[PDB]
């Protein structure tokens, strides 16, 4: 058991143009290097980890998939990106073991979980029974350039579990469940609203049905795999209403409103043989209804990255340049993907998106630009991923790409294309 390790990475990022020409900015065109040291001990049933973080960069690039004068990140910082301790003999289930700490927390869909929290975590991961429930919040970046938790983050809690069986070899029906709560955390009126206030607060649940026959398994030895989801988002937020008198912004009371939405995720990938595969998928967030109470949203922890394309790299399910929230959105996509034993693989998909109710915005962490009343086309996307994996989990160079093409949802005056391209070089020591 290794007990210090040291992880380099190079990542250089061009993006352009975030917010298709209509406001200043929103491109990149820069390169960076991320070291991460890490600690590992193991004695017995327990254990415990640090993972910490140095970063230098020409511009705030993304050099982590995961992630105000308080919320301006620094081309440069320090951060502790995991620090817990692990207790794994409760059971003799290797794959049961109870985590205590800034952690990460992912499923396989990545539409749920896929960060590094501050959590409480049980895994049970046993043969014909899969079972987790844990509780999350974050109470700071542990950054040095970040002084505040975004405000949306801040005082919010999670309490999320599942439970699945393996009906047949490979092929797994389950439930899913997420709670969020933070409300009664607004300002409560006469008090003076900072830019770090909340603007609203809400309490919400999810939960979902889930059937996979082995989705996320690269090296599935079936010609077919699936998954299929269904997902309901319930509950209600407390809009935070204000005024402003000589220069500054105060509470005057709150609107509220239920939420009530639906999601869903439906994929198919045929295995052609040992290297080549193909697939479809469809996925939809329901959107607006009155007050907005028909908007799905995801949980806030999710990365909607996964092994969808049946390689060992993970794929952004919604693009990696429009970079997709299953939020009033809906998706087809088709994929193909090629791999060559452990040293290469490579992915290209192709989505279209279109709008569930046209006068609510999307779901979208790519693109920032408004779009027309009453157009549902939002637009096309291509992407590539390509990977070569290297004798000394495992370095890597990577390309991560993607070219978006904008529909008439956009309109007038924006670019016709936008790209955000990776490549990334990783190293272990
Ligand atoms: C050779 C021994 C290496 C031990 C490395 C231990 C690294 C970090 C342990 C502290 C994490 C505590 C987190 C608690 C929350
Ligand atoms: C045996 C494990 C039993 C329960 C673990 C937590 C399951 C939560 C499922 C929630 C849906
Ligand atoms: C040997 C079996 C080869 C099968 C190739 C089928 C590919 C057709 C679908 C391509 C898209
Ligand atoms: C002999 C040819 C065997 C398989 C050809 C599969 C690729 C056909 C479709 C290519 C696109
Ligand atoms: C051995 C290779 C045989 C057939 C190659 C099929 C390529 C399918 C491409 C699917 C996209
Ligand atoms: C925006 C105009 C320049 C476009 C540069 C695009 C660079 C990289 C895009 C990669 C997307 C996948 C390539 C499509 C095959
Ligand atoms: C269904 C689309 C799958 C992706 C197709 C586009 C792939 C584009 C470039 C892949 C480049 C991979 C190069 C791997 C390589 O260099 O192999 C060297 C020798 O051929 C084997 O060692
Ligand atoms: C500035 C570097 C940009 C790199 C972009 C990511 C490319 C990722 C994989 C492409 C791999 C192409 C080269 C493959 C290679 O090095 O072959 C070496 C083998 O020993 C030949 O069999
Ligand atoms: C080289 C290992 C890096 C570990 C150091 C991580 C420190 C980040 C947290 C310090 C607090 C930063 N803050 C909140 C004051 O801005
Ligand atoms: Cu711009
Ligand atoms: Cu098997
Ligand atoms: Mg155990």
Do not use: C
């Not at 990140?73 to 003999?89: I, T």
């Not at 109470?293 to 990365?303: H, M």
């Not at 160079?397 to 956009?410: E, S, V």
């Amino acid at each position: 058991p290794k007990n210090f390790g040291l992880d380099v990475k190079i990542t250089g990022e061009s993006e352009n143009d975030r917010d298709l020409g209509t406001a200043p900015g929103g491109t990149l065109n820069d390169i960076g290097i991320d070291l991460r040291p890490w600690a590992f001990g193991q004695w017995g049933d327990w254990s415990a980890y640090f993972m910490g973080q140095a970063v230098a960069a020409t511009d705030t690039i993304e050099t982590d998939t995961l992630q105000n004068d308080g919320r301006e990140p620094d081309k440069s910082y320090l951060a502790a990106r995991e620090f817990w301790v692990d207790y794994a003999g409760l059971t003799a289930y290797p794959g049961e073991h109870l985590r205590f700490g800034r952690q990460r927390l992912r499923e396989d869909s990545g539409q749920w979980q896929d960060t590094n929290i501050e959590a409480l975590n049980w895994s049970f991961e046993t043969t014909l029974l899969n079972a987790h429930a844990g509780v999350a919040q974050r109470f700071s970046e542990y950054r040095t350039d970040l002084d505040e938790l975004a405000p949306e983050d801040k005082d919010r809690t999670h309490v999320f579990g599942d439970i699945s069986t393996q009906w047949a070899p490979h092929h797994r029906i389950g439930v899913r469940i997420h709670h969020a709560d933070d409300s009664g955390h607004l300002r409560r009126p006469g008090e003076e609203v900072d830019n770090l206030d909340k603007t609203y607060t809400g309490q919400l649940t999810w939960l979902g049905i889930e059937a996979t026959g082995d989705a996320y398994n690269y090296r599935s030895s079936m010609p077919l795999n699936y998954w299929a989801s269904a997902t309901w988002l319930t509950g209600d937020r407390d809009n935070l209403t204000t005024t402003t008198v000589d220069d500054r912004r105060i509470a005057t009371g709150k609107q509220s409103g239920d939420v009530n939405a639906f999601g869903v995720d439906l994929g198919l990938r045929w295995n052609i043989d040992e290297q080549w595969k193909a697939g479809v998928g469809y996925a939809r967030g329901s959107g607006g209804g009155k007050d907005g109470e028909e908007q799905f949203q995801q949980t806030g922890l999710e990365s909607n990255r996964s092994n969808f394309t049946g390689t060992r790299s993970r794929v952004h399910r919604f693009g990696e340049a429009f970079r997709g929230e299953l939020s009033n959105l809906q998706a087809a996509t088709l994929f193909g993907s090629w791999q060559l034993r452990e040293d290469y693989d490579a992915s290209l998909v192709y989505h279209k998106f279109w709008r569930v109710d046209d006068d609510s915005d999307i779901g979208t962490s790519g693109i920032n630009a408004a779009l027309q009343p009453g157009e549902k086309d939002i637009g096309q996307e291509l992407d590539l991923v390509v990977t070569k994996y290297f004798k000394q989990p495992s370095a890597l160079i990577r390309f991560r790409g993607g070219l978006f093409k904008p529909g008439d949802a956009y309109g007038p005056g924006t670019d016709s294309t936008m790209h955000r391209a990776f490549v990334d070089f990783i190293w272990r020591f």
